[PDB]
Design a protein around this ligand. Structure first.
Ligand SMILES: C[C@H](CCC(=O)NCC(=O)O)[C@H]1CC[C@H]2[C@@H]3[C@H](O)C[C@@H]4C[C@H](O)CC[C@]4(C)[C@H]3CC[C@]12C
Ligand SMILES: [Ca+2]
Ligand SMILES: [Ca+2]
Ligand SMILES: [Ca+2]
Ligand SMILES: [Cl-]
Length: 118
Protein backbone atom coordinates (compact mmCIF):
# COMPACT_ATOMS: atom_id res chain seq x y z
CA UNK A 1 0.00 0.00 0.00
CA UNK A 2 1.00 3.66 -0.35
CA UNK A 3 1.97 3.95 3.34
CA UNK A 4 4.10 0.82 3.06
CA UNK A 5 5.79 2.18 -0.06
CA UNK A 6 6.86 5.21 2.02
CA UNK A 7 8.55 2.99 4.61
CA UNK A 8 10.02 0.73 1.95
CA UNK A 9 11.66 3.82 0.45
CA UNK A 10 13.07 4.92 3.82
CA UNK A 11 14.43 1.39 4.22
CA UNK A 12 16.36 1.63 0.94
CA UNK A 13 17.42 5.23 1.69
CA UNK A 14 18.01 5.44 5.50
CA UNK A 15 17.29 8.91 6.86
CA UNK A 16 7.71 14.28 0.39
CA UNK A 17 6.94 16.79 -2.37
CA UNK A 18 6.28 16.34 -6.09
CA UNK A 19 9.32 15.94 -8.32
CA UNK A 20 9.90 15.95 -12.05
CA UNK A 21 7.09 14.97 -14.40
CA UNK A 22 6.21 11.62 -12.85
CA UNK A 23 6.95 11.73 -9.13
CA UNK A 24 3.49 12.70 -7.90
CA UNK A 25 -0.06 11.80 -8.87
CA UNK A 26 -0.23 10.91 -12.53
CA UNK A 27 2.41 12.40 -14.79
CA UNK A 28 2.82 13.67 -18.34
CA UNK A 29 5.32 14.18 -21.11
CA UNK A 30 8.85 12.88 -20.61
CA UNK A 31 10.82 12.20 -17.37
CA UNK A 32 13.38 14.95 -16.63
CA UNK A 33 16.07 12.87 -14.90
CA UNK A 34 16.93 9.45 -13.49
CA UNK A 35 14.86 9.79 -10.31
CA UNK A 36 11.97 11.02 -12.46
CA UNK A 37 12.49 7.93 -14.62
CA UNK A 38 12.26 5.81 -11.50
CA UNK A 39 8.80 7.28 -10.89
CA UNK A 40 7.62 6.94 -14.47
CA UNK A 41 8.63 3.29 -14.42
CA UNK A 42 6.73 2.86 -11.15
CA UNK A 43 3.75 4.62 -12.70
CA UNK A 44 3.95 2.18 -15.63
CA UNK A 45 4.37 -0.80 -13.28
CA UNK A 46 1.11 0.13 -11.53
CA UNK A 47 -0.47 0.55 -14.96
CA UNK A 48 0.54 -3.04 -15.74
CA UNK A 49 -0.82 -4.24 -12.40
CA UNK A 50 -4.26 -2.88 -13.34
CA UNK A 51 -4.05 -4.66 -16.70
CA UNK A 52 -3.57 -7.99 -14.91
CA UNK A 53 -6.79 -9.78 -15.83
CA UNK A 54 -6.64 -11.70 -12.53
CA UNK A 55 -6.25 -8.56 -10.38
CA UNK A 56 -8.84 -5.92 -9.55
CA UNK A 57 -7.96 -3.43 -6.80
CA UNK A 58 -10.20 -1.32 -4.56
CA UNK A 59 -11.11 1.91 -6.37
CA UNK A 60 -8.91 0.49 -9.16
CA UNK A 61 -5.87 1.82 -7.33
CA UNK A 62 -2.89 -0.49 -6.59
CA UNK A 63 -1.85 1.89 -3.78
CA UNK A 64 -4.74 0.54 -1.69
CA UNK A 65 -3.30 -2.99 -1.86
CA UNK A 66 -1.39 -3.84 1.30
CA UNK A 67 1.27 -6.53 1.07
CA UNK A 68 3.83 -8.02 3.44
CA UNK A 69 7.48 -6.96 3.24
CA UNK A 70 10.57 -6.92 5.49
CA UNK A 71 13.67 -4.74 5.79
CA UNK A 72 17.12 -5.79 7.03
CA UNK A 73 20.22 -3.81 6.06
CA UNK A 74 18.51 -1.42 3.68
CA UNK A 75 17.68 -4.69 1.95
CA UNK A 76 14.00 -5.05 0.97
CA UNK A 77 12.28 -8.42 0.75
CA UNK A 78 8.73 -9.01 -0.48
CA UNK A 79 7.08 -11.83 1.41
CA UNK A 80 6.54 -14.88 -0.79
CA UNK A 81 3.22 -15.34 1.01
CA UNK A 82 1.92 -12.19 -0.71
CA UNK A 83 -0.78 -13.18 -3.21
CA UNK A 84 0.16 -12.74 -6.90
CA UNK A 85 -1.51 -9.31 -7.13
CA UNK A 86 0.16 -8.17 -3.91
CA UNK A 87 3.50 -9.62 -5.06
CA UNK A 88 3.29 -7.64 -8.27
CA UNK A 89 2.60 -4.40 -6.41
CA UNK A 90 5.27 -5.13 -3.79
CA UNK A 91 7.87 -5.67 -6.51
CA UNK A 92 6.88 -2.43 -8.24
CA UNK A 93 7.44 -0.64 -4.94
CA UNK A 94 10.65 -2.55 -4.26
CA UNK A 95 12.32 -1.84 -7.63
CA UNK A 96 11.34 1.82 -7.30
CA UNK A 97 12.76 2.19 -3.79
CA UNK A 98 16.04 0.70 -5.08
CA UNK A 99 15.83 2.80 -8.24
CA UNK A 100 15.42 5.87 -6.04
CA UNK A 101 18.36 5.00 -3.77
CA UNK A 102 20.83 4.77 -6.66
CA UNK A 103 19.47 7.94 -8.28
CA UNK A 104 20.51 11.64 -7.96
CA UNK A 105 18.20 14.26 -6.47
CA UNK A 106 18.20 17.47 -8.51
CA UNK A 107 16.68 20.21 -6.34
CA UNK A 108 15.81 22.20 -9.48
CA UNK A 109 13.19 19.53 -10.29
CA UNK A 110 11.29 19.55 -6.98
CA UNK A 111 7.77 20.89 -7.49
CA UNK A 112 8.44 21.33 -11.21
CA UNK A 113 6.00 23.32 -13.34
CA UNK A 114 4.55 20.22 -15.00
CA UNK A 115 2.20 22.46 -16.98
CA UNK A 116 5.20 23.93 -18.78
CA UNK A 117 8.08 21.43 -18.75
CA UNK A 118 6.16 18.13 -18.92
C1 LIG B 1 13.24 9.23 -2.35
C2 LIG B 1 13.05 10.47 -3.29
C3 LIG B 1 14.15 11.50 -2.77
C4 LIG B 1 14.00 12.43 -1.45
C5 LIG B 1 14.94 13.50 -1.13
O1 LIG B 1 16.15 13.35 -1.75
N1 LIG B 1 14.69 14.49 -0.34
C6 LIG B 1 15.65 15.58 -0.01
C7 LIG B 1 16.86 15.20 0.75
O2 LIG B 1 16.78 14.97 1.99
O3 LIG B 1 17.95 15.12 0.12
C8 LIG B 1 11.60 11.24 -3.45
C9 LIG B 1 11.57 12.49 -4.51
C10 LIG B 1 10.00 12.67 -4.89
C11 LIG B 1 9.34 11.50 -4.01
C12 LIG B 1 7.89 10.94 -4.55
C13 LIG B 1 6.79 12.16 -4.58
O4 LIG B 1 6.83 12.85 -3.28
C14 LIG B 1 5.37 11.65 -5.05
C15 LIG B 1 4.80 10.42 -4.14
C16 LIG B 1 4.50 10.84 -2.58
C17 LIG B 1 3.98 9.59 -1.73
O5 LIG B 1 3.76 10.01 -0.36
C18 LIG B 1 5.02 8.40 -1.74
C19 LIG B 1 5.26 7.93 -3.26
C20 LIG B 1 5.87 9.14 -4.16
C21 LIG B 1 5.94 8.41 -5.62
C22 LIG B 1 7.34 9.70 -3.58
C23 LIG B 1 8.50 8.49 -3.57
C24 LIG B 1 9.73 9.27 -3.00
C25 LIG B 1 10.42 10.42 -3.97
C26 LIG B 1 10.75 9.62 -5.41
CA1 LIG C 1 3.22 9.48 -10.95
CA1 LIG D 1 -10.21 -7.43 -6.20
CA1 LIG E 1 -3.72 -6.93 0.65
CL1 LIG F 1 -8.40 -7.30 -4.29
Amino acid sequence: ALWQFRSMIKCAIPGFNNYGCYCGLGGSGTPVDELDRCCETHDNCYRDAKNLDSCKFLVDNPYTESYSYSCSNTEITCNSKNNACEAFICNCDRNAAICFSKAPYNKEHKNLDTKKYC
